[PDB]
Amino acid sequence: LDPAQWRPNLLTSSSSGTPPPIVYEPYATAPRLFGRLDYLVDRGVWSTN
Amino acid sequence: VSLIRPGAVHRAQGGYLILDALSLKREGTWEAFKRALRNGQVEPVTEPQ
């Protein structure tokens, strides 16, 4: 069992909602819009979770 | 965080940053510098590795 393989990755923490989230992003690169997939290199082996 | 080398922008805060327009347009960093100055964002260069 890989512990880091089954854990809820927290994306956004809720606030009062007043005002609702206002995310302004000047860049439109996909890593900034949709997020990027950081990898773990274990013994020269690339693996993500 | 301990391995972030500063740049011209970081050393220029609270002071005066003097650049070269020919250098900006020739090196292709004009758009990145403009979005850095307008928005406030700075992105230290990261290798793809």
TrEMBL record, chain A:
Family: Belongs to the peptidase S16 family.
Identification of the protein by name: endopeptidase La
Organism: Meiothermus taiwanensis
Lineage of producing organism: Bacteria, Thermotogati, Deinococcota, Deinococci, Thermales
Gene transcribed to yield this protein: lon_2
